[PDB]
Design a protein around this ligand. Structure first.
Ligand SMILES: [Li+]
Ligand code: NI
Length: 74
Protein backbone atom coordinates (compact mmCIF):
# COMPACT_ATOMS: atom_id res chain seq x y z
CA UNK A 1 0.00 0.00 0.00
CA UNK A 2 1.08 3.65 -0.35
CA UNK A 3 3.46 4.58 2.40
CA UNK A 4 4.38 1.01 3.27
CA UNK A 5 7.95 1.24 1.92
CA UNK A 6 8.64 4.32 4.02
CA UNK A 7 6.98 2.75 7.08
CA UNK A 8 9.11 -0.39 6.77
CA UNK A 9 12.35 1.55 6.41
CA UNK A 10 11.59 3.71 9.45
CA UNK A 11 10.57 0.71 11.56
CA UNK A 12 13.68 -1.25 10.56
CA UNK A 13 16.19 1.63 10.83
CA UNK A 14 15.05 3.66 13.84
CA UNK A 15 15.75 7.38 13.39
CA UNK A 16 15.95 7.25 9.60
CA UNK A 17 14.68 10.11 7.45
CA UNK A 18 13.11 8.80 4.22
CA UNK A 19 12.07 10.44 0.97
CA UNK A 20 10.24 8.00 -1.42
CA UNK A 21 9.26 8.85 -5.01
CA UNK A 22 7.26 6.56 -7.25
CA UNK A 23 9.06 6.46 -10.59
CA UNK A 24 6.67 6.92 -13.51
CA UNK A 25 3.86 7.10 -10.99
CA UNK A 26 3.65 3.37 -11.77
CA UNK A 27 3.16 1.90 -8.30
CA UNK A 28 5.99 -0.53 -9.04
CA UNK A 29 9.44 1.08 -9.29
CA UNK A 30 10.56 3.63 -6.73
CA UNK A 31 13.56 5.71 -5.69
CA UNK A 32 14.40 6.34 -2.04
CA UNK A 33 16.72 8.59 -0.16
CA UNK A 34 17.46 7.32 3.33
CA UNK A 35 19.45 9.34 5.87
CA UNK A 36 20.38 7.63 9.15
CA UNK A 37 23.01 7.98 11.84
CA UNK A 38 23.49 4.21 11.72
CA UNK A 39 24.92 4.70 8.21
CA UNK A 40 27.91 6.81 9.32
CA UNK A 41 31.15 4.95 8.65
CA UNK A 42 29.40 2.31 6.56
CA UNK A 43 30.00 1.87 2.85
CA UNK A 44 27.17 2.44 0.40
CA UNK A 45 26.93 -1.34 -0.07
CA UNK A 46 26.60 -1.81 3.71
CA UNK A 47 24.00 0.98 3.93
CA UNK A 48 21.97 -0.46 1.08
CA UNK A 49 22.06 -3.86 2.81
CA UNK A 50 20.40 -2.29 5.86
CA UNK A 51 17.61 -0.91 3.66
CA UNK A 52 17.07 -4.28 1.95
CA UNK A 53 16.92 -5.88 5.40
CA UNK A 54 14.28 -3.38 6.52
CA UNK A 55 12.00 -4.31 3.60
CA UNK A 56 11.99 -7.90 4.91
CA UNK A 57 11.51 -9.44 1.47
CA UNK A 58 8.11 -7.75 1.10
CA UNK A 59 8.99 -5.94 -2.11
CA UNK A 60 9.56 -8.28 -5.05
CA UNK A 61 12.41 -7.28 -7.33
CA UNK A 62 13.73 -4.77 -4.80
CA UNK A 63 17.24 -4.79 -6.30
CA UNK A 64 15.88 -2.94 -9.35
CA UNK A 65 12.53 -1.71 -7.99
CA UNK A 66 13.92 0.41 -5.13
CA UNK A 67 16.73 2.67 -6.38
CA UNK A 68 18.67 3.92 -3.34
CA UNK A 69 20.64 6.89 -2.16
CA UNK A 70 21.88 6.66 1.41
CA UNK A 71 23.89 8.91 3.69
CA UNK A 72 24.60 9.87 7.27
CA UNK A 73 22.97 13.04 8.66
CA UNK A 74 24.35 16.45 7.84
LI1 LIG B 1 7.19 3.84 -9.89
NI1 NI C 1 10.22 -4.35 -12.04
Amino acid sequence: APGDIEDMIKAGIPGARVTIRDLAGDGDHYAAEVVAEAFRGKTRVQQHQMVYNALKGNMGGILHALALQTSAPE
